[PDB]
Design a protein around this ligand. Structure first.
Ligand SMILES: [Ag+]
Ligand SMILES: [Ag+]
Ligand SMILES: [Ag+]
Length: 9
C-alpha cells in the first residue's frame, strides 16, 4: 500500500 501511494504521486 505505501508503495502504491509513492508510485501514484
Ligand atoms: Ag506510478
Ligand atoms: Ag512508480
Ligand atoms: Ag508502480
Amino acid at each position: 500500500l505505501a508503495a502504491s501511494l509513492a508510485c501514484a504521486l
